[PDB]
Design an enzyme around this catalytic site. Sequence first.
Site, PDB file in Angstrom:
ATOM      1  N   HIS A   1       8.003   7.036   8.200  1.00  0.00           N
ATOM      2  CA  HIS A   1       8.568   7.736   7.067  1.00  0.00           C
ATOM      3  C   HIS A   1       9.592   6.827   6.354  1.00  0.00           C
ATOM      4  O   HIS A   1      10.582   7.289   5.802  1.00  0.00           O
ATOM      5  CB  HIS A   1       9.121   9.123   7.494  1.00  0.00           C
ATOM      6  CG  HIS A   1       9.319  10.113   6.365  1.00  0.00           C
ATOM      7  ND1 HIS A   1       9.731   9.751   5.095  1.00  0.00           N
ATOM      8  CD2 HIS A   1       9.231  11.465   6.351  1.00  0.00           C
ATOM      9  CE1 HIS A   1       9.846  10.832   4.340  1.00  0.00           C
ATOM     10  NE2 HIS A   1       9.551  11.886   5.080  1.00  0.00           N
ATOM     11  N   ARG A   2       9.370   5.529   6.340  1.00  0.00           N
ATOM     12  CA  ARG A   2      10.158   4.777   5.422  1.00  0.00           C
ATOM     13  C   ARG A   2       9.224   4.033   4.526  1.00  0.00           C
ATOM     14  O   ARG A   2       9.249   4.242   3.327  1.00  0.00           O
ATOM     15  CB  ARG A   2      11.097   3.844   6.131  1.00  0.00           C
ATOM     16  CG  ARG A   2      11.882   4.467   7.232  1.00  0.00           C
ATOM     17  CD  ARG A   2      12.303   3.387   8.239  1.00  0.00           C
ATOM     18  NE  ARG A   2      11.166   2.806   8.979  1.00  0.00           N
ATOM     19  CZ  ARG A   2      11.236   1.768   9.823  1.00  0.00           C
ATOM     20  NH1 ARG A   2      12.401   1.153  10.058  1.00  0.00           N
ATOM     21  NH2 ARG A   2      10.127   1.345  10.438  1.00  0.00           N
TER      22      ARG A   2
END
Lengths: 217, 218, 220
Positions: free
Chosen positions: C193-194
């Site tokens: 999730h980056r």
Amino acid sequence: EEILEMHGLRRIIFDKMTKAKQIMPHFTVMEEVDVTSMVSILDSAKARNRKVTVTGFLARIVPSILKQYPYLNAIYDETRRVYILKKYYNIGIAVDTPDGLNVFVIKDADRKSMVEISAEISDKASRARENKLQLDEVQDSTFTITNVGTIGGIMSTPIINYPEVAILGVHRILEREGRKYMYLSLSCDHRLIDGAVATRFIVDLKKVIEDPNAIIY
Amino acid sequence: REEILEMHGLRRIIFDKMTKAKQIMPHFTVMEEVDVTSMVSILDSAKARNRKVTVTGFLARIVPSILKQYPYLNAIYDETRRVYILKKYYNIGIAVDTPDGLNVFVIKDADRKSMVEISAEISDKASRARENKLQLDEVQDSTFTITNVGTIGGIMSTPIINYPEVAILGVHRILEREGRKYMYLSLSCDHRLIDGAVATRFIVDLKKVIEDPNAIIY
Amino acid sequence: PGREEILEMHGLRRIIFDKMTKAKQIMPHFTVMEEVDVTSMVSILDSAKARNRKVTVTGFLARIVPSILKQYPYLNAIYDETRRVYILKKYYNIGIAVDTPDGLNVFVIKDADRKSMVEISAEISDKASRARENKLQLDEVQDSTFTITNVGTIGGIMSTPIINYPEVAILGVHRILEREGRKYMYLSLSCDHRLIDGAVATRFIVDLKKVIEDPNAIIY
């Protein structure tokens, strides 16, 4: 093979997302919700006036239930040991941009009616994509709502916009049988948002979206 | 206008041990759907004469059974890295809510105990648990944990295994469809010992039983 | 009463221990899921279990997914250990997850965009059947730009899968169902999730729904 290096915005999320799941161990529950009465409440407010969105509307209830389950809007401090609970219910809502993700924060929700909340969100969106969001406009969220439920999905396990303690997962409206359903999901700091407390909230929020003739009182 | 609230006796005990929980054990968690129709009318009949029992204490009886089929999930993590220690007794952590916080108690040796002996226990272990009268006796060597929230709400959660055990099992609300009664189940576990595959192969080999309790007489 | 037993560790077991410990160590995990009208697929497979053995769901899926990793380039990447790095990859080498007696193995369909439905489904058994027998070679277990894990050949409605570190995305296959009067199935996604945001993640799987959704069009 092409690379890049971590740029401005993409940098902010890199470090805040690592922090997020670095520190807070996540727990997530999901609940089915009969958004039927919901829908026709939106299809009626779209006619007779303007505005409201699924997102906005869910932001109008969310405080009043944070009020009820107090632990759901705090932030976690520098100091291991402490917590600062929060009593000014104001929400953030994450938007997609070009450059990256974002979370503008609409101040003390529980005081702007539904129409407003929902024009607030657009002014803040149609600018989010221009990234002309004054840095004032992104602080102090006690709690956050994320909706993919425009772009799609049916169910997500989100990452808690740190250093809040909870976040809420909104989704596509799905047509099983003949009544319109939408699953919601809540992820939260399981160092403090226990077994029940977690659910007990989502179920309550559920309980309202699932009888809005009530909201009136 | 804000509120400090640090922590107390338990809160602080849970804090460190949730920190410590999901700090080392990477988490695979899977969900199957169970045709619990045939389980419900089992119970709903035992009300009409047999006094008990409960959705949980029923799962609790079968659960050990299925563990002896995949040892890896009834196994405790440890001290140094480098160590595994799977156990071959069966005591099941089943965790209720208190006002103080999240308490967890273990029905010792469930594999020897009776549907009723189990359920007529979780009750007198949890009426206490909220009013806070629970001996150290009643809280040590757990082998695996089940966690019913559906007495409250939810369809599925992503629960976090109770340390230092290796898998956990969420139970959630029961809903009509056809209308046969289904409800989703979930079990989360360590992705070092429990390769994804074999956990799934655990809940289906559980799912199956809940869907054929006639066939529990083996 | 009771009596435990201390069970040590191994080559492959201990390498899974590692890839996994170190998977979630630094890939902060997101999960999302849609449901597919796999009804229009599933039946395609059925016409072709009759005449041309074989072709699977895994087969079917494997051969679409990269053409959808093309549209969103951001999930077909490795995660880098001079820390802040990209290595967005541009060739597709799809992974596979499979249970071998000893432990979870992974393997790679070298260049998926160039192989038709069948060839890949041939290759999968020709490797799983050989990972099972623990005769699978060093050049076959490498270079994966993305990986699929199927469990609904045993069960599961939906699960939160763990990325094959240090990839950057994983897609989780499940059982089919039979709602009414249709055959559905849940798909699942998990991604760093980056290097992968909120929306994008779903925006992806949704377009992947889209081309399971109407295969009839996937001649072109």
